[PDB]
Design a binder for this molecule. Structure first.
Ligand code: VLK
Ligand code: ZN
Length: 164
């Protein structure tokens, strides 16, 4: 149920996920386990690469009451616009936060948990979270937008924390 979330510097976090070939009962089980992991870790999104599953699967819920489940299988970014940024954290980079430039608005297509295609226009927090999770699927972390020295400071603090 609660899968293991990988933390930097694990090279598995740099792996590029393959597309899901068929949305079947196995894929639906992965989706459900990813939500259970996400909520147990108090996250608002989770990408399959963070749990060592090399498939293009994202789960998101930005709601306070944890009752608004968004599933993005094989997501495609169609359009983006504007610029914004907030202090982002990442379950794979424990206890670190930094402001990251992001598009303010995104338009995406994906498959839902039933395999049905849909299109979503998002802004604000949801748009930011979508970009953060899509980055995970191509081996990209928010710290990659930062300077090399800030990246090394992040890497050493996470390592300190993990060595406990
Ligand atoms: C804000 C951008 C999307 C954040 C997703 C991340 C989970 N994740 O790494 C997925 O890739 C998340 O929920 N961050 C929380 C946070 O920033 N407040 C804390 C758990 C750190
Ligand atoms: Zn993350």
């Amino acid at each position: 149920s609660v899968l293991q979330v990988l933390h930097i510097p694990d090279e598995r976090l740099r792996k590029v996920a393959k597309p899901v070939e068929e949305v079947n009962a196995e894929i639906q089980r992965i989706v459900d386990d990813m939500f259970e992991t996400m909520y147990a870790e108090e996250g608002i999104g989770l990408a399959a690469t963070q749990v060592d599953i090399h498939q293009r699967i994202i789960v998101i819920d930005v709601s306070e009451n944890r009752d608004e489940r968004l599933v993005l299988i094989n997501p495609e970014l169609l359009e983006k616009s504007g610029e914004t940024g907030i202090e982002e954290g990442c379950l794979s980079i424990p206890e670190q936060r930094a402001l990251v430039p992001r598009a303010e608005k995104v338009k995406i297509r994906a498959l839902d948990r039933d395999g049905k295609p849909f299109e979503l226009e998002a802004d604000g927090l949801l748009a930011i979270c979508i970009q953060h999770e899509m980055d995970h699927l191509v081996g990209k972390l928010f710290m990659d937008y930062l300077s090399p020295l800030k990246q090394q400071r992040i890497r050493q603090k996470v390592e300190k924390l993990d060595r406990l």
